[PDB]
């Protein structure tokens, strides 16, 4: 799935202005109309500062505002294993990791646009995109292009308070003679971010198996196709 | 079902003057055709649609102090040489302030002339060429909140797997996830929609119109 | 049965005016003089905006007013079954469903008319009705027409407060090894409807086995002939 | 039974001037003929009837602070390899404020001339053609409330069936239904009527008039 908003790990991107985003000015790397190979490669924008003009049928809809956004997430797990081989030797290994996140924000602002078949086809016919797909050299991906287009952006207006706690407990015991060692680490990071900056982005996956098939597009739900992709927050 | 609630708030409501002018000003409005509920953002008739005939009219309803809360508990337990415990606890609460509901009723001739649209006829030809029988959905009514509403979500997922192997290794995995989200929306958005299913297969003389309930 | 009032599931129908209903203006789909195949198909009006004029012998009687209408209905049931087959395997399945409704209304207004033999015969001789009965293609219903005519309408004036609660408990246990799963859901819906709108309608069933027999009419009591027809409230 | 109470409130009372003018202004009035009690809305003499002769007169009675409450308990219990428990509990209460009663007495010649009416003669011919012996009912008196009255209804239906099969499956169904309705009418309506039965069969020289009690 239901949530399709992926949060960014970098907060130094300035927020685009309404006139700039209407004119398609790429002031920040994260902006509407950009094409990226993956979410983790946002800085690798395929478009070379050539944004297709928005036709009269394209609208940015409205600034959906969210107030008093406070969410808490504690993700803790603990694994243990025991390997005993005969003489008799026993091994006990325990690994506990707890990650507790606590975020509070005052105002979030949503902007969203709906891509059309004609607009995407115009974008995919650009020379830069043709060069980029020509860079592909493999047989399994015989014309298989997997590019993500930035479709929606939500911007935080006023910063927010972040708290992160990480507990790591590693207990390793070997009984033969015998040696046991415990390594307990507890890291904390409290912050009060101040300033206006983009908070999260929504991307629509565009895929095309080959020239014989038709290129399809769909909004990404759940987690991205990248390795260990972070799940959508909300 | 009567209505399908949308778990999305990135869709602004259409304005009243543009509701029945044939050219909606919002992402979702009465008169759109979507391939499926999941592909809700792929509006086939993006350009527009024919204006409503004078016989056609929109019926409006009003609601105040409307709230909706639900819970869910799922305990998948397997006991045997392994033990599995999957516990899911979900809680959702929506407290609105004012809700408006718009509904309409279709007509055979209006749907037939709607199927003659350029985008609609292109899609049905592609569907017929690819699939033996085509089927589409049309949005009939929309429920719009006023001023937003408070939302509280509480999710708790606990998965515990203990496997015993018999050199007799034992593997024990115990993961827990908690998520509590509080939101206070302060803008209008679309809450729920009604879908009418139009399908035709087997070289039928005329298409079939049906209603979909959850 | 004694009660013959069926409530509607849609509240967006505007209430007809006294002058409009006397003139037979079909402002709303639910109005006096309309013919419907069934209650669930109210939008499928047989009449094509051609209401037979009311003669001098036809009256709408009077606006019977009901005040302080509060009714509570809790319908709960629980079924269970146990299937044990030998080796020995036992299965326990329980299903509990509870539906609690609570409605409060301030003012309800009743309008009712009594159909006559001549008026119904005039209506049944219309070309639209003849076309509709000609659409029937079967041998069992050799001239068998089952149409419902709207005879009475009760209109709520001031909305009302509605509360609905639905509890669903499904417990499924299998003992072999053994797996048990419980799914408990509890949905709530509280509402305060505001505005004037039609509340319920009374229909009189008209049936005719064939041309040899005479067409009969009778007010429907209890539940309608449709599948899983809702029983009359009051 | 003396009187048959009507469990309906969608029948407005006739006015006094039109009570004895031969053309009633209400759905039910003195002088109507109905095929049966269940078919109470099928007035045979819809057009009207002859005005009351000067010998005929209406007798009126008045009642104040009239209330009527009754209860009912039904416990159908079957014990055996099955168990059935059907418990019905019904409670009804009517509290009026003012009641008026109008009564009349028929005459042989008046009923005979009433049977000569066009609608009445058409019905009796159809009944004689279809059925061997015809029988109709005529409303004699009506009891009319003034200003309505409070009504309280409480219904409780509990059905429990437990079936044991002996692989020994067991089926247990336990359903319960509660309904509490409170109503405050504020308008006049017809409460109860008296019916006179007119029947003739076996080629009788004259028809037979009888009274019906519950």
From Swiss-Prot, chains A, C:
GO molecular function, one term: wide pore channel activity
Keywords from the UniProt entry: Cell membrane, Cytoplasm, Membrane, Necrosis, Transmembrane, Transmembrane beta strand
Source superkingdom: Eukaryota
GO cellular component, as recorded: cytoplasm; plasma membrane
Cellular location(s): Cytoplasm; Cell membrane
Chief location of this protein within or outside the cell: cytoplasm
Membrane topology qualifier: Multi-pass membrane protein
GO biological process entries: programmed cell death
Family the UniProt entry places it in: Belongs to the gasdermin family.
UniProt function note: Gasdermin-like protein involved in heterokaryon incompatibility, a process that ensures that during spontaneous vegetative cell fusion, only compatible cells from the same colony survive (non-self-recognition). In N.crassa, the rcd-1 locus exists as 2 incompatible alleles, rcd-1-1 (this entry) and rcd-1-2 (AC P0DW10). During the allorecognition process, forms a heterooligomer with rcd-1-2, thereby forming a functional gasdermin-like complex that binds to membranes and forms pores, triggering cell death. Binds negatively charged phospholipids, such as cardiolipin and phosphatidylserine.
Binding partners and assembly: Heterooligomer; the heterooligomer with rcd-1-2 forms a ring-shaped pore complex when inserted in the membrane.
Protein name per its UniProtKB record: Gasdermin-like protein rcd-1-1
Species assigned in the record: Neurospora crassa (strain ATCC 24698 / 74-OR23-1A / CBS 708.71 / DSM 1257 / FGSC 987)
Curated annotation (Swiss-Prot), chains B, D:
Membrane topology label: Multi-pass membrane protein
Protein family membership: Belongs to the gasdermin family.
GO molecular function: protein heterodimerization activity; wide pore channel activity
Description of how the protein assembles with itself and partners: Heterooligomer; the heterooligomer with rcd-1-1 forms a ring-shaped pore complex when inserted in the membrane.
UniProt keyword annotation of Manganese present: no
Protein's recorded name: Gasdermin-like protein rcd-1-2
Organism: Neurospora crassa
UniProt KW Nuclease keyword: no
Highest taxon above the source species: Eukaryota
Subcellular location: Cytoplasm; Cell membrane
Gene: rcd-1-2
One BP annotation, GO: programmed cell death
Function comment: Gasdermin-like protein involved in heterokaryon incompatibility, a process that ensures that during spontaneous vegetative cell fusion, only compatible cells from the same colony survive (non-self-recognition). In N.crassa, the rcd-1 locus exists as 2 incompatible alleles, rcd-1-1 (AC Q7SBA0) and rcd-1-2 (this entry). During the allorecognition process, forms a heterooligomer with rcd-1-1, thereby forming a functional gasdermin-like complex that binds to membranes and forms pores, triggering cell death. Binds negatively charged phospholipids, such as cardiolipin and phosphatidylserine.
Segments for region (Disordered): 1-19
GO cellular component, one term: cytoplasm
Keywords: Cell membrane, Cytoplasm, Membrane, Necrosis, Transmembrane, Transmembrane beta strand
């Amino acid at each position: 799935m239901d949530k399709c908003w992926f949060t960014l790990d970098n907060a130094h991107y300035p927020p685009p202005s309404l006139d700039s985003m209407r004119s398609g000015h790429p002031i920040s790397p994260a902006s509407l109309g950009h094409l990226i190979p993956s979410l983790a490669h946002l800085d690798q924008i395929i478009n070379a500062k050539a944004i297709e003009p928005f036709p009269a049928t394209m609208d940015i809809h409205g600034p959906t505002i969210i107030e008093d956004f406070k969410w808490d997430h504690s993700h803790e797990y603990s694994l243990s294993l025991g390997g005993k081989v005969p003489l008799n030797v026993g091994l006990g290994g325990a690994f506990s990791r707890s990650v507790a996140n606590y975020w509070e924000f005052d105002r979030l602002e949503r902007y969203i646009m709906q891509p059309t078949r004609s607009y995407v086809q115009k974008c995919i016919e650009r020379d830069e995109v043709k060069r980029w797909i020509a860079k592909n050299k493999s047989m399994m991906m015989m014309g298989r292009w997997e590019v993500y287009m930035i479709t929606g952006i939500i911007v935080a207006r006023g910063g927010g308070r972040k708290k992160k706690e990480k507990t790591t407990g590693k207990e390793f015991s070997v009984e033969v003679p015998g040696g046991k060692r415990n390594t307990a680490r507890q890291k904390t990071w409290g912050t009060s971010q101040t300033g206006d900056f983009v908070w999260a982005v929504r991307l629509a996956k565009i895929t095309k198996s080959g020239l014989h098939s038709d290129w399809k597009m769909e909004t990404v739900f759940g987690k991205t196709s990248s390795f260990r992709g972070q799940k959508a927050i909300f | 079902e009567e209505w399908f609630p949308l778990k999305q708030t990135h869709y602004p409501p259409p304005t009243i003057p543009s509701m029945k002018t044939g050219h909606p000003t919002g992402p979702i409005s009465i008169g759109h055709i979507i391939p499926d509920l999941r592909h809700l953002d792929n509006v086939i008739n993006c350009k527009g649609f024919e204006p409503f005939p004078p016989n056609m009219d929109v019926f409006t309803a009003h609601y105040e102090q409307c709230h909706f809360g639900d819970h869910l508990n799922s305990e998948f337990v397997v006991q045997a040489s392994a033990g599995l415990h999957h516990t899911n606890i979900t809680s959702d609460r929506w407290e609105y302030d004012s809700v408006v509901e718009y509904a309409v009723y279709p007509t055979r001739q209006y749907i037939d002339r709607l199927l003659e649209s350029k985008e609609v006829r292109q899609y049905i030809q592609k569907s017929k060429k690819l699939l033996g029988g085509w089927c589409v959905y049309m949005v009939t009514g929309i429920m719009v909140a006023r001023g937003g509403g408070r939302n509280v979500t509480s999710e708790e997922k606990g998965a515990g797997v203990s496997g015993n192997v018999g050199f007799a290794p034992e593997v024990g995995w115990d993961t827990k996830t908690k998520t509590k989200v509080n939101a206070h929306h302060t803008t209008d958005f679309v809450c729920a929609i009604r879908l009418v299913k139009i399908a035709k297969s087997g070289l039928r003389s005329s298409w079939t119109m049906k209603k979909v309930t959850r």
